Structures are given as structure tokens and as C-alpha cells.
Design a protein around this ligand. Structure first.
Ligand SMILES: c1cncc(N2CCCNCC2)c1
Ligand SMILES: c1cncc(N2CCCNCC2)c1
Ligand SMILES: c1cncc(N2CCCNCC2)c1
Ligand SMILES: c1cncc(N2CCCNCC2)c1
Ligand SMILES: c1cncc(N2CCCNCC2)c1
Lengths: 210, 204, 204, 198, 206
């Protein structure tokens, strides 16, 4: 098989609307935000404008192929793949996707989708201009799939938090932590999972001694 | 049947442009706003910028399937389903849909579509900075289907007003009430139904 | 026939790009603006931001069906229908369509398309803060179809001008009048019709 | 033939991606801006916000039909037609197309596309508040078709009496320019808009 | 062959989702920004609003045709072509594409896509109002293709930095330089290439 064959097969047979549940177990989705920039902050309105890579990971066996004498990976338009219906609960704007909408697919069916996104959130901005900084909590989970269909988990807890964060922001990141939750909503009997990402950041210029 | 089969069947026989009217009974549509945030308020212009979940519920029997030894529910792109043509009469901006446009479909044909929406409205903002607060009235109904085709049912089950309302808003919700109306418009002989949602809120 | 059949038949044979002229006749289009709100006004720049229903009416016999034992009307996506290419000549922004893009089609081929639209216009704002008010003139007609192909006419429902107008606007409507014109443009030899809607309003 | 037939034929044999070249000659495109309004001007930033009709004209013989006892003209969605890939070089926003995207097609293959467009430009705004006014120069031409493929040629009437600005004069100039990317020359029309604040 | 035939053949066979890798070489992509305008600058927030032509070049042999007694080049909608998935890493707004989305394709398979783009970036604006000016660094590379699949190189080191730059901007360009990098990201074992374009500019008027 060559890349053309693999992509043909995927385009023809992937079922983008079909969640790749295996043996009635939930699709395990890993989610992780890599913060790139903090553009605007409003301590009056408690709103923040942020850029981050939404590193998203899951397995879809229907995409798999025999790679013994073939490419190990391909890039695939997400329009040709099932993607988790993740949403930020406290987002107050549509996700502005900054990057080409392609996912990386490995021959065993592992998928990595990691778009860079600019989005505004409603969260706690108080203390942003102090040493202690503010802690903006961002809640992400499947909008319509409950816990027997999608589970969400934070990816690896090890990584430079500012690895990709802009040195030119007026802000700096003090700490990023992630927490998993399972919540019942009044609309529905089922529990839905989410990841809460706590972004601890401050404005540059209040850790001064002199 | 597995999920792939069900979704295949729905996609193939989906008639998204066909209202699932049963024996010339109107399609009963339930509508409910769960307020998430109040972003901007202008007492001069009487305009508010709001985020809410638009919980929308109705039955479409053409979607139903035998779930004996099959999944009980699936998520479906609304592009594959008929959806009520609801509109907010006093909205002054296009609905900004914040969330993935999927509905939840139960095997008996019950549909739940509940997008998070940001939208601006023209309404009464006076008193927003008093302890009595302002009462912003939002009117939602079918744009083109009269009461013999769509009825809008304003009843809510188990929901507290601020249940999903952001603790970080400059505003707090005092009360949310819903009222059903049936209105005749000069263009047309038929009555069209709407739900009016009265949002009583104030600045913290 | 049921709704599914009717909508199927329409989708399969509508021909959205084909103006439904019968014999030697223009398609008669009725146009009428029902003002809902006046959001922003600038007396310096002579610009206004307005919300209105653009009530649009015409007949397309190719849509017609025998309604003997069948539904008398259906809602149809305008993407499946021929629609008049109307434009506001003095609009300075794209029409922001606020409502679901469906038209109402009667079994005899009569179509009613009435979206709510927000749009900015260049017009005379002088006097807006006086008792006499300002008179903003809005010009609407077919962009590409001359008078032998499309005729436009004011339809009046002599409803209240303020019938659907928001009580929460900072403005009030004093009067709305409509005038029909036939104009020749230097580009082309034929006359093109338009309706001029004169909105007389003032600041409260 | 009736309108339905003609539009059917055009839709079915529409090669919107195929430039209607005949005999190795360039498609002659006429362009002309009819200014409707000048909405915002910034003399500090040298930016103007303008509304104009972009009157665009060319011939496509593949659209032609025998109009013996048939309609002489039809309106056609531009999605069903080849359209010149014109762009304003000094535009700083996407063209906002205000009008229905239909072209008028005559039975001999002549096409007239004339949308009303709102767009912002970078140009010389200095002098706008003098009696001499400012002269904002707008440069339009095929983005990807050189002069052997597309030639461009020029062709207060419709200008709003309610604008804060008035037009003193409009002149058009044709140019042929070579760009460092490519060996061929690309043609453009430069429209000079002389206007002032009332 | 005439233009209609060529375009038909391309549309019918081009495979837009398939990277035209030849014999396990990466597709060599050249990228170069020709700056047209600098519209807004914010030295407090370190954000700039810029217009530039994103001159993008690569070879796709599957597009090739015999051009004996045929046209040597055609313009093709990019929707009918595979295009590199380039992105500016420090862009803070979606690319606003100002121009018709057509690429120029030569009969040997060489492609030139050069849209004019308006986009906002996060970069170093400090010094913009000095004689020395600011240097805004813009990082562009394949979002999902590593170095064995896409290599990126500056179209050239030899250029007039200001040939198409607007004389009506409030800013002037002092210098443009380009640097190639190969970076490993914590998500993945492979290296991804980028071009860093350093825009040295200042506000006019000393
Ligand atoms: C079903 C269909 N559409 C949306 C939801 N919800 C409530 C459960 C958790 N996700 C947010 C919206 C549930
Ligand atoms: C028919 C076609 N399009 C819109 C309407 N209306 C009048 C009925 C109530 N809904 C608002 C618009 C009616
Ligand atoms: C033909 C094709 N495109 C636009 C027009 N016009 C001129 C006739 C009056 N209508 C406005 C635009 C005519
Ligand atoms: C070829 C492909 N893409 C863009 C261009 N150019 C240079 C020729 C003149 N038009 C501007 C862009 C040429
Ligand atoms: C694979 C799939 N999606 C995103 C990436 N990345 C990391 C490699 C460098 N490019 C940015 C995003 C890689």
C-alpha cells in the first residue's frame, strides 16, 4: 500500500458520524491544552482571550491498515474521520481554528488531532495583576456523548507548561493543572465526563523586588 | 443493530426538509433556555449579549428503530435530521452556535438538540442596576410553521435557574419564567406559537 | 399526497436558477418591509443600522400541486426554490439574515419568503432628533432582471407601522410610505423596477 | 429554446474553471468601478472604506445559443460560469459582495457581472479635507492570468448624496507589469478616485 | 491538448488529500513572504496586523502533462490540488485570504500558489518607534508533516525586501531575513521544519 491507497481507503470507508466504540466500552479520549498565548484579559468582566493547541487523542480501529511494507502514518482531513464532539463549557465565543484541519493517523488506528485555537472564555480573572496570579479554569468534554460512550482523560502530566507559550505575551504562566470530572445534568440521566484545565497566570511585572 | 447501522439508516432515509407531522397533529416542540452567561448589557440601547443552552425537544418517529439488542441512543449531525425552524423574534444578531451541531436521538424517535448559543437581543434593560433587577423578555417560536404544524411547549422539568449560570459573570439571575403565546400576524391568517422567556437579572 | 411527497417533488424539479415566467409576462414580485428595530443611527455619517422583515411574495406555478386530499402548504428551503434577486441599492453592508431560510409555498404556487434581516444603509438621517423626524429612503429591486422579467410592487398590509416595531428601541416610527419606480441604468437598455420605502422616524 | 432549456444547457456544459480563450488570444476583460459611497476614511492610516459596483465584462462563446425565437439574455449564477480572477492589489479586506451573485449572459456569449462591493483599501488619503481633495488609487487585475491570457481595459452618477464625501473626478489608467515571481506581464487597471470631505 | 482537457484531467485525477511524495523523498516546499502592508501595531500587546503575499512553491508530478503543442501552464482552483498544510505558529487570527484561490501549474508539475493574506501575529513590537525599529519574527511550517514528508526552505535569500510594500503605510521595512529550523515537539518523535521570517520595521518619522 502507498499513501494514495491508504487515504483512498479511509475516505471511502471511515464513518465520520460513527463513534468507534469497541465492545460497548467508551472511546477513551485524551485531551490536553498547550497554551500559546493570552491575548486579552478583563478583570472587570472576567473574560480571557486565549490561543492554545487542543491536543486530542483517541483510537479508531476502523482506520487501521497493515503497514508492514507501507507508510506508518498519514495526514487526513477531519472531514473524513470521526472526531470527538468536544466543547469548552465556559467558552463565550466559537472556537476559531487557526490551523489546517488535518489529523495524524497511525497505521494501528491511533489519531492525533491538535489544532491551534483562539477562543474567549468566562473564568476567574481576579488576582491577575498580583504575584499569586489568577487561576482561569477551562472545562472541556463531549457535548453529547455520556461516560459509557466517551471518557475524557488528561494526557501526560509531564511537560514544560510554557514550552510553546509566547515570550511576547503580556502574561506568563505560573502553573497548569488538569482535573477529571464526571457530571450529571438535569436534562439527562447519564453522567458526562470533562477535563478541567486550571491555568494559573499573571501579568508580567508583579514579582519585582527592585 | 449497531451504531454504524443505525446512523447509516438515518442518514439514508433522513428527510431533513420534511416536518415529522403525525396524522396532521402539530409537531410538539419543547423549548427551554439554560442561561450560562450575561456578557454585556447596555441600559441606554436596551441590548443584551447572552450565552444560553437552547434545550430543544421533539419526537420524530421516522428516526425510530428496534433497540432490543441494539444501542438505545445515538448522536446525529442535525444536517441529517429535520429540525424545528425556531427563531428569537427580538434577536438582533445571528445565533452564534458555540458547540458541535449534533442532536441526541433515542430509539423511539425522541430528539434532544441542545446547542450553546451566544446571541444579542433587544429587550428591557432598565433597572438592571437596582436590587429589583431588569427583566429581559426573549420570544422564541417557529418562523414559518403555524400552530397546526408546530406547537411550542414551554414547560421545564427539573431545572434550577442559575444551575449552569457562571459564578464569574458580572450579573446574577434572580428568576427565569416561561410563558406560551399564540399570535396572529398581519401577513397570514394562521396563529403561530411562541415561548416568551423572562430573564430577571441584575448587576452583582 | 403527503408533505414528504410534495417536498420530494419540489426538490426534484424546482429549478432554483430558472425564473418562473409564464407566457409574455414578468414575474410579479411584491415587497414590503416590516420594521422591527432601529439599532444605530449616525447623523454625521448618514448611516443607519436596521432590523426588518423583508416580506417577499411571488407566484411559481412549477411548484403547484393538487391539494385535493393533501396539505395546502409546506415550508421549503430557499435553496430549493427560485428566489427574486432583490437588493437594497443603498445598503452598505451584506444582509444579515437572522431567521431560518425557509419560504412558505401554497399548493397553487404562491410563495411567501419573509426573513428578518439586519442591515446598514446610507440615507438621510438629518432631523432624526427633531419632532418632524428623519426620513430614510430605502431602495429595493431586482439586481439583474429588467421590467419585462421582474416587476416589483409595494404591498401594504396597512397594519400598524409600529405593529412589530420594538418598544425598546431608542427610536419611534412616525410613518412608512412606499413608492414604485422604473429606472434605466447606463449599463443597459431596459428599465429596472424598484420599490422605495421611506422610513420616517425620530429619536424618542 | 426557453429560459429553462438555456440555463440547463449552461449549467450542464459550464466549465467555470476553464478560461474561454479563443485562438491563443487573451480574453478581453473590461473593468469599471461605479462608486456608490465612501463610508470611512482615515488620513492617519491612509485607509478608506468604499462601496462600488464592479462592472465586469467579457465574452465566453461556450455560453452562446441560437436566440432565433428564444430569449436574448438570461441571469446565471456565477458559480455556473467562468469568471475572471480579478483582485484589488491594495485591498486590505476581503471583498464584501452585497448583491446576489448572478451575471447577465447575452445569447452571443457576452457576459456582464456587476456586483456591489464594500471593501477597504490602502491608499493616499492626504488632502482629503482640502478643496483639492485626496486621490485614492485602486489597482485591479487578474491575480494569476498574464497578458496573453487576460487583458484588462477600462470601459457621481450613482454616488450617494448622503455621503460625507463628494467625488471630484474619477480617471482610469491601464498598466502592464512584470512581477519578480514570473516572466510574463500582468495587466491591471488603476482607478484614481479624487474626492474630498464636504 | 487544450486548457479544457488539461483542467479536466487535473480535476479528475489530482487527489488533493494525497501528498505527492516521490520515492520517499520529502516534498520540497519553498515559502517566502512578500510584505505588502503593516496595518496595525500594538507595542503594549505585542501584536501586529499584516498583509503579505505567501509565495508558496512545490512540485507535484501527478499534475504533469505533455505540453508539446499544448499550453505550458494553467490556473487551477486549490480545491483541486494537494496543497501544503502550512501555518504561522504565532498567528493569532485565521488567515484572511484576500485573493482568488487559484494556483499556477506548469506542465512539468511545478506549482506556484501565492495568495495575498491579511493576518494578525503575536511578536516583538518593542522598538517600533525607534530608529532601530522592531523585529517581528514569523514562524511558518507544515502543521502535520514532519521533515521526511515536507521540507521547507526560503524561496530565496536574494530579494528586494520592499518591492511591493505600500508607500502609504505608517511603517517602513528596514530589513527582511529568513532562517530555516528543524524542531522536535513533545507530542511526537519526529522533527518538523519551519521558516522563520524576521521583519525589521519601524514607524515612519524617526
Ligand atoms: C444531549 C444533547 N446535546 C447536549 C447535551 N448536553 C448536556 C450534557 C453534557 N454536555 C453539554 C450539553 C446533551
Ligand atoms: C411565513 C413565512 N416566513 C415567515 C413568516 N412569519 C410570520 C409567522 C410567524 N413567524 C414570523 C415570520 C410566515
Ligand atoms: C446586469 C447585471 N448586473 C447588474 C446590473 N445592474 C444594472 C441594472 C439595475 N440593477 C442593478 C445592477 C445589470
Ligand atoms: C501566479 C500565481 N499566483 C499569483 C501570481 N501573482 C503574480 C502576477 C500578478 N498578480 C499578483 C499575483 C502569479
Ligand atoms: C501532528 C498532528 N497535529 C499537530 C501536530 N503538531 C506538532 C508538530 C508541529 N506542528 C504543529 C502541530 C502534529
Amino acid at each position: 500500500l502507498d499513501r494514495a491507497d491508504i487515504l483512498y481507503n479511509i475516505r471511502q470507508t471511515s464513518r465520520p458520524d460513527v463513534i468507534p466504540t469497541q465492545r460497548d466500552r467508551p472511546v477513551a479520549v485524551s485531551v490536553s491544552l498547550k497554551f500559546i498565548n493570552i491575548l486579552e484579559v478583563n478583570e472587570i468582566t472576567n473574560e480571557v482571550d486565549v490561543v492554545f493547541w487542543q491536543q486530542t487523542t483517541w483510537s479508531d480501529r476502523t482506520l487501521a491498515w497493515n503497514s508492514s511494507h507501507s507508510p506508518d502514518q498519514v495526514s487526513v482531513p477531519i472531514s473524513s474521520l470521526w472526531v470527538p464532539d468536544l466543547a469548552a463549557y465556559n467558552a463565550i465565543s466559537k472556537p476559531e481554528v487557526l490551523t489546517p484541519q488535518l489529523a495524524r493517523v497511525v497505521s494501528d488506528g491511533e489519531v492525533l488531532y491538535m489544532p491551534s485555537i483562539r477562543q474567549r472564555f468566562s473564568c476567574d480573572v481576579s488576582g491577575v495583576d498580583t504575584e499569586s496570579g489568577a487561576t482561569c479554569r477551562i472545562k472541556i468534554g463531549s457535548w453529547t456523548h455520556h461516560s459509557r460512550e466517551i471518557s475524557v482523560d488528561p494526557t501526560t502530566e509531564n511537560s514544560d507548561d510554557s514550552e510553546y507559550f509566547s515570550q511576547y505575551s503580556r502574561f506568563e504562566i505560573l502553573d497548569v493543572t488538569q482535573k477529571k470530572n464526571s457530571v450529571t445534568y438535569s436534562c439527562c440521566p447519564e453522567a458526562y465526563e470533562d477535563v478541567e484545565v486550571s491555568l494559573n497566570f499573571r501579568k508580567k511585572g508583579r514579582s519585582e523586588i527592585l
